[PDB]
Design a binder for these strands. Structure first.
Length: 408
RNA sequence: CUGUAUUAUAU
């Protein structure tokens, strides 16, 4: 039984011959073509392996669809393994296919079929440049599928590769925001506690929450940390660290075109977020209800605060609108007068009516009487200005919300 | 006379 060392034949001019194509826009090798850009029916996966042409198919639309179609699913099939080997044998080739507009779709197909063994090498390849892959419009789709399908220790290793990176620039990126959200919504909190430490800084939190994309990152993190079933307070301490920055900067965030949505989320949530709801109303909304109610963005925040606040805070909000402001020196107009005829404030006055109408069904008699007293104050001002309000769509809806009402 | 986001890849 003499030994045989079988070295591989050097085929050093095969990429050179796969670079010949009919079209200059397509990469399909001419030998696989039918002349019309499609894959000739004589072609087999063994032909792609024999000619070392995996990249050139993967970078072509129809050749990549051919790869996705015929790739065996089972991990013990020999063609599966030889293709997987061609994919992963060179790290730079692998990462370039991940960043391609067409080849990424083959990489995802491999992940759909992968077992733990294949996932280890895929994870080792991806970790070497995870940050820039998250920024790429093609590769981020691979990273998100990897977060979904990988065993959690592998997905954790990859997620931890983002620690100490430029997470503002990544969180606000049109591609990377979805990678951060997929991590936060999918993986255990221990895999991304570094993201909560990053957002503890006020400047990072502000720069991210006031962004069309970053506000989604902050909101998905709050949703995950607030949903609970626990005996100690780990997610409690993490949530507390994040919410402190939101509460410290909620006056600016509530009036922002993007961050207003997460402030409303904190207020509508209740339960684990209820204490933070109360802080926002007391330290940001109060003393500012009139100005915020005339703003395009913050007027939605004031609506949800009237909708969801506990009675003790609804009372301070009500008392500010009816009694909190010095009437205008020229017009003698108070806050309710302004909001009744304002294009944004009319919506706040409508929530105030709805809140009071539903609060009349409250068990405590004093509360029911107090909600009725506020409705009577609104009814009176509306009557004094009905001749004008009935001409607007807002005033018609206000008058209809106050009809057939037994206040006490 | 009605009032705000994002919800992203196949030349």
């Amino acid at each position: 039984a003499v030994r045989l060392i079988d070295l591989e034949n050097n085929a050093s001019f095969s990429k050179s011959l796969n670079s010949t194509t009919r079209s200059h826009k397509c990469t399909l090798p001419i030998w696989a073509g039918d002349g019309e850009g499609n894959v000739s029916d004589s072609v087999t996966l063994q032909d792609v392996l024999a000619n070392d042409a995996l990249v050139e198919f993967a970078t072509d639309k129809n050749g990549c669809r051919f790869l996705q179609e015929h790739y065996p699913t089972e991990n013990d099939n020999d063609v599966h393994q030889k293709l997987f080997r061609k994919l992963v044998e060179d790290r730079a080739i692998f990462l370039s296919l991940c960043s391609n507009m067409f080849g990424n779709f083959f990489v995802q197909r491999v992940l759909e079929c992968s077992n733990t063994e294949e996932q280890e090498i895929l994870t080792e390849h991806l970790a070497t440049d995870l940050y820039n892959l998250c920024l790429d419009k093609s590769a981020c789709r691979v990273i998100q599928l990897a977060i979904q399908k990988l065993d959690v220790h592998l997905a954790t290793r990859l997620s931890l590769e983002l620690r100490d990176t430029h997470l503002v620039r990544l969180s606000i990126d049109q591609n990377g925001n979805h990678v951060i959200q997929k991590i936060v919504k999918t993986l255990p909190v221990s895999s991304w506690t570094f993201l909560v430490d990053f957002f503890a800084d006020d400047d990072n939190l502000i720069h991210v929450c006031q962004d069309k994309y970053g506000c989604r990152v902050i909101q998905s993190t709050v949703e995950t940390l607030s949903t609970d079933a626990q005996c100690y307070q780990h997610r409690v301490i993490l949530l507390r660290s994040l919410m402190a920055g939101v509460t410290r900067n909620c006056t600016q965030l509530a009036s922002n075109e993007f961050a207003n949505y997460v402030v409303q989320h904190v207020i509508k949530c209740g339960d684990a977020l209820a204490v933070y709801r109360d802080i926002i109303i007391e330290q940001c909304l109060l003393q500012n209800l009139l100005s915020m109610s005339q703003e395009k963005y913050a007027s939605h925040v004031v609506e949800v605060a009237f909708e969801c606040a506990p009675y003790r805070l609804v009372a301070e909000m009500m008392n500010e609108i009816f009694e909190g402001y010095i009437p205008h020196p020229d017009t003698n107009r108070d806050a309710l007068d302004i909001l009744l005829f304002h294009q944004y404030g009319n919506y706040v006055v409508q929530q105030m009516i709805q809140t009071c109408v539903l609060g009349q069904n409250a068990r405590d008699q004093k509360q029911s009487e107090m909600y009725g007293m506020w409705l009577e104050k609104i009814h009176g001002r509306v009557m004094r200005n009905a001749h004008r309000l009935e001409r607007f769509s807002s005033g018609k809806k206000i008058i209809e919300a106050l009809q057939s009402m037994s206040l006490y």
